[PDB]
């Protein structure tokens, strides 16, 4: 093969330019043996490896085999015309969010979350705010630059806003789970009305949460976004910091 590099035909690299040496490793659910090796080589041949050779194969169980394969890929990628997808946005890491807060904001992001009304459901907001988080996604209070305050299950809206004012909360988290007779939307509207009457609807992000609430519903009720059952703590932290830097809102520490 020609060893000159062509940027319209970028190909993997082994020890010589313009070859295709690539490495694979996968487990097939078949008993080990010659037939398993042939199956692995045929499978890797469909992926585009020209001369797939099973470097290694060993039985993980009576019906599982682990393979390592090397081959010269035939496919090529047009690097010169490749365009970067700027739309790729993802939740920041823990330390990434910490340094983001430290850079773009002097203060610690004060977050006050609480289930309000008569709901006893708190495993969601605890999944968001507790140190161990949820499925390895540590909660907001684990973050160095966040002062998370969790007020519990049955917190009346008056107590919630009072605690937010007392602590100087930059953002407020409300969790609603029981949707019987649409009691959740009623309580959320009451919360927004109380905040607006207090004159401090601004100055604070007002995020919503729950299993049967969606961004459309939150925006309908006047909340700054709302997170459904699939949310983790890093999602909430990324939103709470990004939307706070975008809209430069002052925490309630400046409210007397």
């Amino acid at each position: 093969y020609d060893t000159t590099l062509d940027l319209t035909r970028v190909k993997p690299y082994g020890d010589t330019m313009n070859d295709g040496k690539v490495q694979l490793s996968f487990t097939l659910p078949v008993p080990d043996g010659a037939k398993a090796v042939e199956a692995a080589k045929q499978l890797a041949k469909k992926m585009g490896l020209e001369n797939p050779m099973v470097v290694y194969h060993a039985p993980l169980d009576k019906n599982f085999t682990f393979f390592i394969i090397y081959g010269s890929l035939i496919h090529t990628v047009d690097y010169t015309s490749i365009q970067v997808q700027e739309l790729e946005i993802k939740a920041m890491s823990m330390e990434e969010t910490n340094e983001y807060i430290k850079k773009h904001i002097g203060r610690k992001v004060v977050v006050v979350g609480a289930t309000t009304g008569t709901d006893a459901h708190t495993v969601g907001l605890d999944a968001i705010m507790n140190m161990k988080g949820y499925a390895g996604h540590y909660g907001l209070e684990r973050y160095e630059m966040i002062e998370a305050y969790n007020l519990g299950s049955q917190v009346p809206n008056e107590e919630f806003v009072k605690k937010a004012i007392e602590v100087g909360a930059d953002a407020l988290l409300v969790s609603q789970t029981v949707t019987q007779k649409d009691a959740h939307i009623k309580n959320l509207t009451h919360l927004v009305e109380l905040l607006e009457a207090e004159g401090i609807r601004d100055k604070v992000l007002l995020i919503c949460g729950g299993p049967r609430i969606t961004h459309e519903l939150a925006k309908e009720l006047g909340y700054d976004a709302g997170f459904g059952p699939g949310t983790f703590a890093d999602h909430v932290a990324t939103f709470i910091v990004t939307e706070m830097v975008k809209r430069k809102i002052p925490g309630l520490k400046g409210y007397k």
Partner: protein, 517 residues
């Protein structure tokens, strides 16, 4: 004494004194209070099981009935035994009657306490005999197979359905795993009840239910007979149902389980007082049943600077050891945990990790110490992750750690594949075989880096423990001494579930398991 780190044994004695005094001051409170979960565990140990029509476990129904309509400060045993003497029904059918609303435990004329104590005693004794027989059976199995002397390879399976967990655990056992832990469903520490029956669904893992324990133990016994070596089963107990899950493990013959005193307070915001009260009963049950108790010190060093927070881990280990001792757990059942969680870019970091591991091994010479893999500094580079796991295994084998939670080279990107688990097991076997007797050969230079590091960490831990003792345990938790997190003593979940004991309060199982056998 014999030490490769030239430890200041007077300093270690002082630290143990401080930890014991802390635990004694905390115990002054624990012995005067009980919790809802403790009473529910008392209900379970008397034979109450099942769920009502709405799915609420019957122990929950009975205990909440007694609390809302009566005086829970007298204990669930008092009311259950009073009903037993009054109507003659077995406790399970008494619970069924209460669930159906036919029987009101508080409206029955209360009999004299002595008769109630006699009435419940036979059931309590039979349950205690069941747990003792389970311990004896585990000992018989371990004697039959002659377990290994090297580290036990500890693996994890979290498919979320029990009937698949059995298959994955059997495969892992056949691959070489000696201890198999089924990841409890995420955030189950926040549930005030233990679900019922086998669970075919769950996020992050399978729920900790008695039927799941039964299924898993039967399945693992099959493979233990197949392979001719005993295979242990592990699960989690922390959080708002600690005594209940401990009782379920004791009745189903779990071999290990995570029982950390401070985990609930620090990392789940469980109420300070409730966790301490129910941890006592959970650990009493575990110690009587012969279960090895693991601790979650690894949480301290994750997302934290492991070089500056080693003394906090040591102090937590000492406090946990004392909390286990006050509950009657022998030192051979205290699987105190610590992690190989230092920065891989730190020069001489391996020396510091070796120093800390050897120091823990020295202070707790009998404990089946658990050592955990690096997770904070793992990356997508699976090859360097494999090298880091190799170094972790090297430390494990050098310092004679008993239990060894295998690290996975793909820890930073996803839950391990079967191939990743096989590779990790192979690497661990290779390193443990090549360095089988390295721990006996290696010694450390007097006044060297390792000895100085161990002494420094021990001094810091002693100072922290003395400060905590001066402050008090609850005050110290409030001040943020542990895991740099401040916990109000009246905040957290489950504060409403703590009730001060009545003078006539009685619990047969505390006496049966602490003083018997």
């Amino acid at each position: 004494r014999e030490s490769k780190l030239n430890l200041d044994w007077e300093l270690v004695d002082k630290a143990r004194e401080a930890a014991r005094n802390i635990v004694k001051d905390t115990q002054k409170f624990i012995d005067a209070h009980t919790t809802v979960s403790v009473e529910r565990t008392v209900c379970r140990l008397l034979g109450i099981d099942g769920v009502n029509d709405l799915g609420v476990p019957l122990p929950n129904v009975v205990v909440d009935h007694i609390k809302s309509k009566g005086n829970l400060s007298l204990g669930a045993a008092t009311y259950i035994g009073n009903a037993m003497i009054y109507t003659g029904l077995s406790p399970q059918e008494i619970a069924e009657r209460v669930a159906k609303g036919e029987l009101d435990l508080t409206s029955i004329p209360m009999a004299d306490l002595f008769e109630i104590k006699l009435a419940v005693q036979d059931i309590a004794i039979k349950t205690v005999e069941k747990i003792r027989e389970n311990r004896r059976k585990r000992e018989e199995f371990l004697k039959k197979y002659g377990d290994k002397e090297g580290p036990l390879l500890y693996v994890i399976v979290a498919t979320g359905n029990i009937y698949e967990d059995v298959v994955q655990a059997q495969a892992a056992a056949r691959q070489g795993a000696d201890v198999i832990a089924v990841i409890r469903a995420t955030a189950q520490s926040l549930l005030d009840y233990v679900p019922y029956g086998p669970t075919t669904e769950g996020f992050g893992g399978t729920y900790a239910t008695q039927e799941n324990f039964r299924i898993m133990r039967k399945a693992l016994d099959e493979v233990s007979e197949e392979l001719g070596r005993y295979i242990r089963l592990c699960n989690y107990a922390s959080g708002l149902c600690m005594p209940e899950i401990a009782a379920m493990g004791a009745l189903e013959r779990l071999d290990v389980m995570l029982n950390d005193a401070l985990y609930g307070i620090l990392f789940r915001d469980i109420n300070m007082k409730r966790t301490m009260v129910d941890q006592f009963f959970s650990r009493v049950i575990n110690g009587f049943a012969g279960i090895i108790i693991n601790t979650g010190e690894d949480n301290y060093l994750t997302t934290a600077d492991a070089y500056e927070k080693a003394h906090t881990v040591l102090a937590s280990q000492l406090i946990n050891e004392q909390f286990a001792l006050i509950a009657g757990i022998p030192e051979e059942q205290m699987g105190l945990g610590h992690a190989f969680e230092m920065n891989p870019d730190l020069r001489n970091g391996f020396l510091y990790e070796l120093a800390q591991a050897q120091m823990v091994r020295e202070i707790f010479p009998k404990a089946p110490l658990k050592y955990m893999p690096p997770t904070k500094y793992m990356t997508g580079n699976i090859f360097k992750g494999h090298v880091q796991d190799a170094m972790f295994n090297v430390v494990t084998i050098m310092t004679k750690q008993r239990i060894h939670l295998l690290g996975m080279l793909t820890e930073a990107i996803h839950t391990p594949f079967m191939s990743d688990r096989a590779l990790s097991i192979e690497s661990a076997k290779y390193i443990f075989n090549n360095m089988a007797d390295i721990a006996d050969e290696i010694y450390f230079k007097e006044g060297g880096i390792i000895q100085r590091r161990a002494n420094e960490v021990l001094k810091k831990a002693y100072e922290l423990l003395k400060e905590i003792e001066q402050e008090g345990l609850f005050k110290a938790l409030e001040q943020g001494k542990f895991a740099d997190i401040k916990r109000p003593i009246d905040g957290g979940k489950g504060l409403e579930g703590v009730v001060e004991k009545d003078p006539n309060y009685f619990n047969p199982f505390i006496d049966l398991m602490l003083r018997g056998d």
